[PDB]
Amino acid sequence: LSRWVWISLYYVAFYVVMSGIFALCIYVLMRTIDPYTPDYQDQLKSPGVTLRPDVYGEKGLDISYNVSDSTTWAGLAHTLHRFLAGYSPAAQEGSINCTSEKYFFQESFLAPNHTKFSCKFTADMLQNCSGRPDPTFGFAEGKPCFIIKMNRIVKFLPGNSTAPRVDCAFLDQPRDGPPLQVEYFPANGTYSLHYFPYYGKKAQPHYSNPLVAAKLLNVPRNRDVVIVCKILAEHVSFDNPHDPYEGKVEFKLKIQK
Amino acid sequence: MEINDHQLSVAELEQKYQTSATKGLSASLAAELLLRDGPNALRPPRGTPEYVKFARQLAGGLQCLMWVAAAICLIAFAIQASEGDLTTDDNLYLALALIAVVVVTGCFGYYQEFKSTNIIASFKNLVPQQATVIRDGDKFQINADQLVVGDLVEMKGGDRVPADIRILQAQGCKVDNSSLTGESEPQTRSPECTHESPLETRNIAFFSTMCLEGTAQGLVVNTGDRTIIGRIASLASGVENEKTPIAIEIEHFVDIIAGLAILFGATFFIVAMCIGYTFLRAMVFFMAIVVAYVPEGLLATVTVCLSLTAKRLASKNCVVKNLEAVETLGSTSVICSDKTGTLTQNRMTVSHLWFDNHIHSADTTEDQSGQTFDQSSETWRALCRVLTLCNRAAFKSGQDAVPVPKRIVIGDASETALLKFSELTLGNAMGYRERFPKVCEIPFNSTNKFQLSIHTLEDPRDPRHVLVMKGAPERVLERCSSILIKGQELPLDEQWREAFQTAYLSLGGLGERVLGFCQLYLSEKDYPPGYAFDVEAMNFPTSGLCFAGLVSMIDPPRATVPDAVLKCRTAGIRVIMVTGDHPITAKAIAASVGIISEGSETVEDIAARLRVPVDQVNRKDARACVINGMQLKDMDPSELVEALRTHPEMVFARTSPQQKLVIVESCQRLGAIVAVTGDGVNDSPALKKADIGVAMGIAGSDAAKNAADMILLDDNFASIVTGVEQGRLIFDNLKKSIAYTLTKNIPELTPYLIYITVSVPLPLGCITILFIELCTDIFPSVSLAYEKAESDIMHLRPRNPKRDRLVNEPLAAYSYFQIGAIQSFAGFTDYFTAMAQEGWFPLLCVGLRPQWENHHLQDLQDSYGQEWTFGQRLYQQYTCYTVFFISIEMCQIADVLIRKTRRLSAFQQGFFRNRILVIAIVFQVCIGCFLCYCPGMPNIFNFMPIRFQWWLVPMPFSLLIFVYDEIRKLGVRCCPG
Numbered sequence A: 001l002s003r004w005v006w007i008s009l010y011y012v013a014f015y016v017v018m019s020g021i022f023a024l025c026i027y028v029l030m031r032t033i034d035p036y037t038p039d040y041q042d043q044l045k046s047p048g049v050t051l052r053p054d055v056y057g058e059k060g061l062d063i064s065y066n067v068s069d070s071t072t073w074a075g076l077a078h079t080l081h082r083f084l085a086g087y088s089p090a091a092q093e094g095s096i097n098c099t100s101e102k103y104f105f106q107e108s109f110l111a112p113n114h115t116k117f118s119c120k121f122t123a124d125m126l127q128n129c130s131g132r133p134d135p136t137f138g139f140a141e142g143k144p145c146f147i148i149k150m151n152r153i154v155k156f157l158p159g160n161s162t163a164p165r166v167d168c169a170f171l172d173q174p175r176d177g178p179p180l181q182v183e184y185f186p187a188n189g190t191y192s193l194h195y196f197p198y199y200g201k202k203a204q205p206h207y208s209n210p211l212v213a214a215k216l217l218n219v220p221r222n223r224d225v226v227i228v229c230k231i232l233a234e235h236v237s238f239d240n241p242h243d244p245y246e247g248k249v250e251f252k253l254k255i256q257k
Numbered sequence B: 001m002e003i004n005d006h007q008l009s010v011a012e013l014e015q016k017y018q019t020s021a022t023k024g025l026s027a028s029l030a031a032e033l034l035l036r037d038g039p040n041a042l043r044p045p046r047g048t049p050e051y052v053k054f055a056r057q058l059a060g061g062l063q064c065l066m067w068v069a070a071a072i073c074l075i076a077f078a079i080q081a082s083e084g085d086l087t088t089d090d091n092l093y094l095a096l097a098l099i100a101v102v103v104v105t106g107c108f109g110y111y112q113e114f115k116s117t118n119i120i121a122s123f124k125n126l127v128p129q130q131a132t133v134i135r136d137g138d139k140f141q142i143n144a145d146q147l148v149v150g151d152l153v154e155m156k157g158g159d160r161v162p163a164d165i166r167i168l169q170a171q172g173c174k175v176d177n178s179s180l181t182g183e184s185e186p187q188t189r190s191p192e193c194t195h196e197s198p199l200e201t202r203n204i205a206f207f208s209t210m211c212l213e214g215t216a217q218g219l220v221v222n223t224g225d226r227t228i229i230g231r232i233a234s235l236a237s238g239v240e241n242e243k244t245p246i247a248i249e250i251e252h253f254v255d256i257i258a259g260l261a262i263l264f265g266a267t268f269f270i271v272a273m274c275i276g277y278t279f280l281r282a283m284v285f286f287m288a289i290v291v292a293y294v295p296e297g298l299l300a301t302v303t304v305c306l307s308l309t310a311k312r313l314a315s316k317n318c319v320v321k322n323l324e325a326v327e328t329l330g331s332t333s334v335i336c337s338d339k340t341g342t343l344t345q346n347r348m349t350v351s352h353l354w355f356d357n358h359i360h361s362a363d364t365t366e367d368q369s370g371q372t373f374d375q376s377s378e379t380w381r382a383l384c385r386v387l388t389l390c391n392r393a394a395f396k397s398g399q400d401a402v403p404v405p406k407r408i409v410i411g412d413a414s415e416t417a418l419l420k421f422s423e424l425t426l427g428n429a430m431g432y433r434e435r436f437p438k439v440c441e442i443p444f445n446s447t448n449k450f451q452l453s454i455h456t457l458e459d460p461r462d463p464r465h466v467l468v469m470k471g472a473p474e475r476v477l478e479r480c481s482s483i484l485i486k487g488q489e490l491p492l493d494e495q496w497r498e499a500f501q502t503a504y505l506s507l508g509g510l511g512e513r514v515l516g517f518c519q520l521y522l523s524e525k526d527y528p529p530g531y532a533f534d535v536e537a538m539n540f541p542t543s544g545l546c547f548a549g550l551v552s553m554i555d556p557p558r559a560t561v562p563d564a565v566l567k568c569r570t571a572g573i574r575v576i577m578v579t580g581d582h583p584i585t586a587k588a589i590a591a592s593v594g595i596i597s598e599g600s601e602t603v604e605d606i607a608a609r610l611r612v613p614v615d616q617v618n619r620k621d622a623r624a625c626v627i628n629g630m631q632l633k634d635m636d637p638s639e640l641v642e643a644l645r646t647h648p649e650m651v652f653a654r655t656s657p658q659q660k661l662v663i664v665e666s667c668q669r670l671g672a673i674v675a676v677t678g679d680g681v682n683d684s685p686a687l688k689k690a691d692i693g694v695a696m697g698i699a700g701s702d703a704a705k706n707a708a709d710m711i712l713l714d715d716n717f718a719s720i721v722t723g724v725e726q727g728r729l730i731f732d733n734l735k736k737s738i739a740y741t742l743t744k745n746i747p748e749l750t751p752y753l754i755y756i757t758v759s760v761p762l763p764l765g766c767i768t769i770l771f772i773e774l775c776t777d778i779f780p781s782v783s784l785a786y787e788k789a790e791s792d793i794m795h796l797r798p799r800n801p802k803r804d805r806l807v808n809e810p811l812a813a814y815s816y817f818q819i820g821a822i823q824s825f826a827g828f829t830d831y832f833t834a835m836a837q838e839g840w841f842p843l844l845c846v847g848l849r850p851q852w853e854n855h856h857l858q859d860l861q862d863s864y865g866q867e868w869t870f871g872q873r874l875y876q877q878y879t880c881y882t883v884f885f886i887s888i889e890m891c892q893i894a895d896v897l898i899r900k901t902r903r904l905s906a907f908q909q910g911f912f913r914n915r916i917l918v919i920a921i922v923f924q925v926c927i928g929c930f931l932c933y934c935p936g937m938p939n940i941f942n943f944m945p946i947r948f949q950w951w952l953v954p955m956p957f958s959l960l961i962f963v964y965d966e967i968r969k970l971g972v973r974c975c976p977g
């Protein structure tokens, strides 16, 4: 009659108790945890590299378009617009003109509302590939602009000597033509060292990764080609057979006419 | 249809079979008759192909649950290579793994049954039997299998009866029908039709039986399958082998599993679709859940445990034909047991003597391990002289290593019994006999009905003759006039005849065959050396002799049998005799072995002592009961149930093959699990219908052995008690090994339940769930087989099959939703620790799966804003695998320890005392570490070298399990209420 209640109430008792025990495990774990620095960075050995505008195929990044058909590239450009809508002077007020040119170590929290200073990085620094004077970021010409962005890992330092460069070159350079000529923006193709080291989203709520534009100039039309686009910095490795995005980005590209 | 032959005239038999009753079959005509009917033997069981004997191992309750599982897995995997580009194919792995254990187990079962039936077949001493046939008027020897119907054959003492023989003429021909009937004493065979039922006539001799003494000739009436032997065997075709109690139990918990898998899968399909998933994926998780309740290694481990118990019994000369049988004796509540050749040795041996006015008691055991009798007296030395000298039996040559009770003897039945008796009291009887040259002898006849012989003495200083004679006790008594007693040779006055007659009837009352012995030394005056005695002239005394004593014989229990019966009853198992033999012998042995306890009595005994009619006896007072087949024929099944319920110690005498099967059935139907033990063809039918059929390896008929599930290779009836013990351990221990194996299935599933309903990154992978199920926890769960008992196991009643199951709903509920629960909160705490210490806080983790698994995000942001590539997120997912796995392993050290005992605390019985279990915890941790810290392992098996905080996060949860089960077990222990 009334004993299924006396056992089921044992189960609701047992699961409430056990749940609470788990809760206190979480709570106590959430004080192990520093809000500004992750305990271990075990898989972020070297930074990931991402490209933009990213279009993916069966085998990975696969960008393909037709200079004469804006349908096939408006979208591409419109991603580069949306991507850079957060590099506008408008949405860069929370950061400051770093000019230091070497690492921007901060040990205390001297920025508004108990935070740290993050550097400004504005679209117009990509110059020709900034979406002005060309709102198609070089696609309508056949000399497209690919934005390269290095993944941020907290307190990661790329290298003391130079700034990290982006070298971007053919995988198999066509055997009736020359190497890939690229123009980078900024000019050597570098991420300036005052953007490193990243302290975290809580620390620098307004941070924005340095971008480098790669304007590909002499890609032969109507041919399948693959561009490797790796990062040269001392603490940055790009030869990992189980992450092909550690330290680089490969992409296949065909520009049709 | 067989009945025609023993009722025909010799003219009619010669007509029917185109034969002569004295000159026999023509030669060519018997060549043709052989072409017609085939050889004279029983055509073996049809014989199923090798590939199908493999096929049938892949079938069974767990097995079919696993085939349905892999069925579901392949239906789902097809749905999923249709539903976008998924190269996940976990269901390929799981389904193919299920097929894998089902199959590999299959090989193991097939190979076990192979090796076991080679072990049984290789003690079967197939030596071709022969027969004295007469053809064209010639007596010669042919193989028994070449006898065609209508042949004229001859038998003498020693010969095996070659076919089914209808007897035309016989001189004092007695026979051993114990393989067909129950009867332990020799059965007369004479040519006159004594019954219309050919089983109960005396003018047929049966295909498989032994001619013990005398001589007969008769015509062949059936060969091969058509003989009463092949007919009673063919009865055991029409008996269907019901399924074992262990098979029932397995199917019970397969049903519990199935219930759970449906109830869950359904509940989370409702939930899955209320979370806005597509019906087409909510069916995929329905499927994954349903399959997730099917353990992957269970079938493997139980098929290992049964196999280890089989090895134990095989070590004790108890070969089992298939693994399920190692359990059955533990669940048995009654033993329907054959008498002659089973409980007894089927060998008439001297059991008692009457001499110096006392009934002495000889040691009837086969290993000679009991109380012999007093051999001081002059009377005994004389009585030994008479029974040793008046005897014509002789051991076959070169038997000196053979123990005497097992030696082959060229003699009659009584004479064989007595010859072994002299060889075990006097020592070297035949040489002794040689030392007293026989000068005259009348052998047993139908005129005199006694055997006598006259001998010259041993030394030369006594030159007398000694006349020794033996025969039926009354017939010996009237022929003699004094009695040896205590060095006196007193006159045989009225009181000695009354006391002799009292002893004779007492040994007849215990169902023994009594023989009287006597002597007379002959004068030198009247009978001087070289005197020509003449048996026809009778020129010597056959009267006025001197009585020595009585010697009496019986078919006696096997040495270890009385004790074996004792222990089975100590362990709550009802023993029932079911014997074809006559009630008086049946009841004697049922006393001797402990079936009928010292001091209980039948209703006929109560009437006989109280001096009342049996109508007045209160049946409730009679703890024992004997019922022959005749009364059992005129019994409603309700009367049989009244008798079985009313009279604890039941003996069925004169019981046909079918009646044994019917007593088995009546118990079974009353709820019993029934074991039957049996010698021969008659008990073969009961053997098949039994929950477990036990055949005697040596004494046993091919029919019996074939029906039986288990063979006592050395006829040691005490093996039975070992069977009870090993089937009570391996049951309790399986209840342990299963409880362990089932408990990992909830921590293996709650990750996927959460990963669906919360969209957390995947805590635990398929590729690693397989390692748990088939690698890390196998050796622990098998080690539980080696647990010793937690009680005086052989003093416990047999389990109630309807109440106490292998897996109850309480047992499951406990192992799944309490110990499994604690394991899942263990793993999930180690999961959220492993992620927060790497960058991902819990609140971020809800909903994060779409982005987690997206190949088109190589910059997904953690809680510190750092940006992971998909590959990096994947190596984190493997770390999540490995910590959830290790949480499960630590909690399965706690599991294997608390599942050592169901009642007792670990402090009492121990921790390190099961040594195989300890080796298996070391093994489990070693495989764990090899999977974590070997190089290459993140890529080959998706296992990360986890940090050493991740091992310890489960420790409190493990110890919590230990303490929780202790408190429960102490609750049961120190409070039955």
Ligand SMILES: CCCCCCCC/C=C\CCCCCCCC(=O)OC[C@H](COP(=O)(O)OCC[N+](C)(C)C)OC(=O)CCCCCCC/C=C/CCCCCCCC
Pocket: A015, A019, A020, A022, A023, A024, A026, A027, A030, A031, A033, A034, A035, B750, B754, B758, B820, B821, B824, B825, B828, B841, B842, B843, B844, B846
């Ligand atoms: C039928 C049986 C069902 C049993 C299900 C389990 C129910 C119990 C589960 C959750 C209840 C809430 C537990 C968490 C709250 C703990 C107390 C608390 O207040 O802690 C604060 C945290 C942190 O706060 P923050 O991250 O915003 O700040 C970061 C803090 N700083 C900046 C200092 C680092 O709050 C948080 O994270 C909130 C996290 C809430 C989401 C947790 C993830 C949900 C996963 C559940 C899986 C459970 C497995 C169940 C196994 C059952 C086996 C049968």
Ligand SMILES: CCCCCCCC/C=C\CCCCCCCC(=O)OC[C@H](COP(=O)(O)OCC[N+](C)(C)C)OC(=O)CCCCCCC/C=C/CCCCCCCC
Pocket: B087, B088, B093, B096, B097, B100, B101, B104, B297, B300, B767, B770, B771, B774, B775, B778, B939, B940, B941, B942
């Ligand atoms: C109790 C005894 C039972 C009898 C044994 C039966 C065991 C059979 C169990 C499973 C068989 C199925 C596996 C066979 C298929 C191999 C396929 C292969 O080509 O493999 C490579 C994979 C690595 O895939 P990935 O995840 O890196 O790819 C990711 C791909 N992307 C990126 C597209 C997602 O590896 C794998 O799947 C392999 C996964 C295999 C998991 C094994 C589970 C542990 C079993 C242990 C039994 C050990 C017996 C030893 C006996 C010795 C006696 C002398």
Ligand SMILES: CNCc1cc(-c2ccccc2F)n(S(=O)(=O)c2cccnc2)c1
Pocket: B090, B091, B094, B287, B288, B289, B291, B292, B293, B294, B295, B296, B745, B748, B749, B750, B752, B753, B764, B765, B766, B767, B769
């Ligand atoms: C039988 N008990 C062990 C078990 C087996 C699976 C499983 C189910 C479907 C397909 C493949 C699987 F390995 N699961 S599972 O909880 O459903 C699960 C866990 C993690 C990833 N996928 C599913 C649990």
Ligand SMILES: *[C@@H]1O[C@H](CO)[C@@H](O)[C@H](O)[C@H]1NC(C)=O
Pocket: A097, A099
């Ligand atoms: C940012 O600071 C630099 C440092 O030299 C200065 O030249 C430049 O005018 C500033 N840009 C602004 C305020 O837009």
Ligand SMILES: *[C@@H]1O[C@H](CO)[C@@H](O)[C@H](O)[C@H]1NC(C)=O
Pocket: A128, A133, A183
């Ligand atoms: C960038 O654009 C300007 C024209 O506005 C031109 O002066 C300069 O040469 C361009 N650089 C490249 C590499 O095209």
Ligand SMILES: *[C@@H]1O[C@H](CO)[C@@H](O)[C@H](O)[C@H]1NC(C)=O
Pocket: A066, A068, A069, A256, A257
């Ligand atoms: C796109 O280029 C193709 C050559 O591949 C050309 O035929 C076509 O006209 C172009 N598209 C349009 C819309 O003209």
